[PDB]
């Protein structure tokens, strides 16, 4: 998958899909590990709104894997969220 | 748990598959097939 769905140019699919991410995050820690590059692109996309939340759940999943320091740098660049 | 129902109720383990062919078949194997040379 439900993260691969994000080839639509409208970002409100990505906010719908992050609304899915914090919902069914309790079973799907693996898919973001293949979707690291999507969190890198959507993180480095400025006017795209969900870069801060991409740093949030990227800190969650890299917290889960063991990248606590990239969870830390995302926790820095994650904003007030 | 480990039980849950059950407390109420170079050896053979090496050979038994070829020894099956030494259990049902080829008893007089080269002693009828050894007899093919002169019976036929």
């Amino acid at each position: 998958g439900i993260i691969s769905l994000l080839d639509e140019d409208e970002p409100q699919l990505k906010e719908f899909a992050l609304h899915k991410l914090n919902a069914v995050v309790n079973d799907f820690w693996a898919e973001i590990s293949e979707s690291v590059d999507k969190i890198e692109v959507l993180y480095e996309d400025e006017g795209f709104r969900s870069r801060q939340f991409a740093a949030l759940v990227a800190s969650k999943v890299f917290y889960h894997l063991g990248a606590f320091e990239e969870s830390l740098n995302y926790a820095l660049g994650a904003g007030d969220l | 748990m480990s039980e849950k129902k059950q407390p109420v109720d170079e050896d053979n383990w090496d050979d038994d598959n070829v020894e099956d062919d030494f259990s049902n078949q080829l008893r007089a194997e080269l002693e009828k097939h050894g007899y093919k040379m002169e019976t036929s």
Partner: protein
């Protein structure tokens, strides 16, 4: 999905197919029955078979195992066809192509034709001695395209008349003269480090 294969959008095709796998992975099994419910797994089985994903073939045979045996001859036929790819290959492909009444599977058994033709491009020359033109005529169909020419020249070898030798392979009888005698005692160096860390 039928529009994604109508336009040949494969990532959105298997992505919408992954959506449908999330619609039967939907945590309420108590759903009404769509008419394509099994041959969508036949689609996923077929292209998932053609893209060479065999652990996906086994979690295909494992995510819904028990219903794959009896119903949907478009499930039983690609897995007995997988037994035909396992044993008796190049003998039942076009005969199996003679049996798909649900015309959406020819598109992906053409991808199975692609994984046929590369294995012709690896399994009749450079593994044998010589094959005559008529066997490449049989298994390489249409009897002289620039396709079987493209395979005969794709091996990196120039054809003879009425013949395809499978020569010019496995040269020099390689030996690796003294390199393991160097590097394995280079392993013995850190074996002496294993004499070093222990006092």
């Amino acid at each position: 999905a039928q529009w994604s294969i109508l336009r040949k959008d494969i990532p959105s095709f298997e992505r919408y197919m992954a959506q449908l796998k999330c619609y039967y992975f939907d945590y309420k099994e108590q759903l009404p029955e769509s008419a394509y419910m099994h041959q969508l797994l036949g689609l996923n089985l077929l292209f998932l078979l053609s893209q060479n994903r065999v652990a996906e073939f086994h979690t295909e045979l494992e995510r819904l195992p028990a219903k794959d045996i009896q119903t949907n001859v478009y499930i039983k036929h690609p897995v007995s066809l997988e037994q035909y790819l396992m044993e008796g290959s190049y003998n039942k492909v076009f005969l199996a192509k003679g049996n798909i009444p649900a015309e959406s599977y020819t598109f992906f058994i053409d991808i199975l034709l692609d994984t046929i033709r590369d294995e012709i491009a690896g399994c009749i020359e450079k593994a044998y001695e010589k094959i005559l033109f008529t066997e490449a005529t049989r298994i390489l169909f249409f009897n002289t395209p620039k396709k079987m020419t493209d395979y005969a020249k794709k091996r990196g070898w120039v054809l003879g008349p009425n013949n395809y030798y499978s020569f010019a392979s496995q040269q020099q009888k390689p030996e690796d003269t003294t390199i393991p005698s160097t590097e394995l005692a280079k392993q013995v160096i850190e074996y002496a480090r294993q004499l070093e860390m222990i006092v």
